[PDB]
Amino acid sequence: AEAGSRLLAPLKKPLIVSGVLQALITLIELAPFVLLVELARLLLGGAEAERLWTLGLTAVSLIGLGAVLAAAMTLWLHRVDARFAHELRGRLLTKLSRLPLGWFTRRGSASTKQLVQDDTLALHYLITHAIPDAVAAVVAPVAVLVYLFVADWRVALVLFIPVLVYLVLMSVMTIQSGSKIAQAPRWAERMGGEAGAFLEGQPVIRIFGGAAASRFRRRLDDYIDFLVSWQRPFVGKKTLMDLVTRPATFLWIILVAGVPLVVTGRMDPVNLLPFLLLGTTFGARLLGIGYGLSGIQTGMLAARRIQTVLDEPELVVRDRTRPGTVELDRVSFEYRPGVPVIRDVTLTLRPGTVTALVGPSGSGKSTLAALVARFHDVTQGAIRVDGRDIRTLTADELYRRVGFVLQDAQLVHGSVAENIALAEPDAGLERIRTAARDAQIHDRITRMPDGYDSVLGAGSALSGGERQRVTIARAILADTPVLVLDEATAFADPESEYLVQQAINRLTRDRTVLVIAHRLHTITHADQIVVLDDGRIVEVGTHDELLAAGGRYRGLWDSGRY
């Protein structure tokens, strides 16, 4: 695979060394049985006691040496793989920090987890075990079979029958399960999302349809049906391989071929000792890679998926290369190709001026804030903060220059001080407390049992208006040259809404503001009102100017009173 060998290039030298070491280790693991064959042969021949002791003790010691070496080899190799996964998962978390934000919306959180965690974990057999098991399953069977072919071809060729049956079973098992392996990660992705939606949308499930009619239960039944069809013939072939390759099976076939040869005069019983001792040890080697091809097939697919995300476009900080002045210029944007959400928006925002963006729902007034944040790149036009393009600014400079509130109070699992101080984790408690006091949430925090240390994960959430005010406190603590507010204080009651707006205006008196609100009565103070309808600027002016103009703004204002 081009996408696999490119991802596993850093582990080149460890992988070839592992194949070389395992070739020597497995040879060392077959040495004792060569010495025990000599010990048995000397016992029948009546050699002296001291000669027997040297052979017997050497074989027993070599068993300990082989076991220590194999344990040490896998220990080093399992530490190499653990380090590569940590580096690879770090690489992925760096890439996802830079991908356009439309990557996440089309994909969901379940697919991201299956990428960062489960796909990297799916490589474990491919790195840590594939090359040792492959080399072990080539060296030991070839070494044993050639050695036994020298000892006696009649009983040696009979050992090929369980070998060929194992070779046929593994190929049939591999071909049959190949399609199912490809479908497995997508099924896991779907069930990860459905399970996450089942757990996240519990209030909807409990009222609308219950457990029986839930989409999760239908998928859960379908996934288990897929697993049964995948795992029934797979495990059936898997156990046939074990039965074929068992040492008991090998010993039985050797004796079936050997006993009629020994009872007849065709061969002496002394020549059974290589077969009875060495002929029954390479079965486990074959089974190691037989059970491993599914691990290689999943690993190669996961390597392809991981490298594909690492090859994704990146919102590259271009090298082309008045404070707080955001200037949109002939901007157009499309979430999906052929679906315009913004159509030639020209708008300039100056320091100390509050620009209000209003319009019908679905008119694209949140895409403008997203493009100003550079969650997505503008399809046309440009957005310049202090002249410099956002595409030329780095992420740190951009998000130091402009801060955002995003209409969806996304909190992170942790203390509420850590949620308020998301921008500056090094920020002190006094800075956090002052930010919350301005956002009118500090009073709510004091009533919690843990205070500001109260963990804020799922289940321990807050009311809708309370979690919104937390994200306002987050933007207050950032203190950026530009502020943007996407439906801030939407869930707030009138008193708290007035207090929050007063605090916001007091803080950003001389700072650029872009406020989005559906309640136009809160927008009467705006220096300029921007009306967005179907992604195009239909009118710009003050509140009284738009009321006199009698357009979309006047229609919305009239329909507000009901």
Partner: protein, 564 residues
Amino acid sequence: IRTLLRLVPAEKRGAVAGYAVLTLLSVLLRAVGAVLLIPLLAALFSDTPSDAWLWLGWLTAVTLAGWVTDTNTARLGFDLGFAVLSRTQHDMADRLPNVAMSWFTPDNTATARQAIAATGPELAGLVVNLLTPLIGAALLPAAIGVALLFVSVPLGLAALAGVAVLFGALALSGRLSRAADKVAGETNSAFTERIIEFARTQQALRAARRVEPARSQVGSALAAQHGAGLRLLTMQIPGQVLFSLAGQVALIGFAGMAVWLTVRGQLGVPEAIALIVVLVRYLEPFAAIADLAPALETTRATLNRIQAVLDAPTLPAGRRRLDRTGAAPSIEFDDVRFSYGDEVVLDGVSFTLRPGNTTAIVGPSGSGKTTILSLIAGLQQPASGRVLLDGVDVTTLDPEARRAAVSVVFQHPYLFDGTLRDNVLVGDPEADPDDVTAAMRLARVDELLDRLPDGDATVVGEGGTALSGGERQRVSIARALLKPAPVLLVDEATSALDNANEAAVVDALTADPRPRTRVIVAHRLASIRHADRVLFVEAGRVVEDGAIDELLAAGGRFAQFWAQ
């Protein structure tokens, strides 16, 4: 195996008994076939090798019975493993909607997610992958040791002594690696939660510059998960050394007793040579136990998580059902009290709703308005005090009857990942298209179909991510109206809609032809238009109620709430 036997269905315990008998027969046949080499080779090495035929026939029968028994053991292990998979996964799916909402702490939600995430082939192949070879490896050298007693008594006890150190090694190796394996699971589960939060909260993290791995929380969880996985690899070194020593200790004891007997003439040289092969068969389970011992620790954690979900405390219920279907019922609270943990939300609510009328709940943010709707809908339940639908206790009502009684519009509209119509149809999947269009039209979703390119087939994202805030609010409102339940609770249907969409939706909450007892929640005076009675709630109790103009004239907290 004790934990795994809890999850077995009671209807399938005949298969378990059949499985356990066949597994023992697998071990007994394997040991007998191994020990059958001692008299077979002794006869073969003698001056009359024809005596080997009898022992070869006994070996063939013992092996052929082994293949049949091992194939059946596989079939029963597959069936038992997938039987436990389907029944446990389905029982979690049935139980979880009835599990208390207090159960879903962020740690339990992780456990429930990991428990559901175990649906893959790993858990389904548990009996075949782990349990069958573990029982086989555990009892194979014990069975060979017992079978050796028939040849030589002390030789058998030497083999049994080797089994004693193996089980001692198995017990000790598990103990040594236990603490590190537990920590590895905790950091690997925490890292899972942070990736899901990392992808689900990208916009906020990116704006805060908390998205790089050197500065993110997912990066810290990755760093913790790396160290927890490294120390586990170090702490399994004692376990691997201990199994190696156990294999060598048993090898020395077995070989030491064979030579000790052979020197005395109590054991023939062919029998001694045959015992080298049986000794190889003896030592193979010692290595297999070492390979499977770490897997036993992880599987114990997996089943413990599944049992944790199945142990979750379910909501109280009963068997009562209302007298007639789709009759507008009365709703009343009787000293209802409720608290999230220790935080008290509602502290003595008592009111009554007329059947068929529409009353509007109002109050400040965080007052507990959505909690009131939760108790009416039955998502929550009071600590003390009771809620009655039509003079019938909800807590003693049937799960289906209580479910059919209420359809709600939630404060934060959550849409499942799917088409727009799929989310609307969740209100009533068996509803004809004529009522579907009526519910869509009243919610002003028909103004989204023309605007959006794909109409009602538009693929919503996770939650309502691929739709705007107002768009998902209207789709949620269509879902509530479509359901034919005679109670309609409305929670912040205005919060994301413009003035034109607000007015039509608010008026459409009455244009609904069906008779219902409606409950409206809002912080906006225009949205509570048409309300027959207003319920003002503050500090966890109804402080004031009446008519809109009555209270405004009275100049109460209702008036002050609009006067700011």
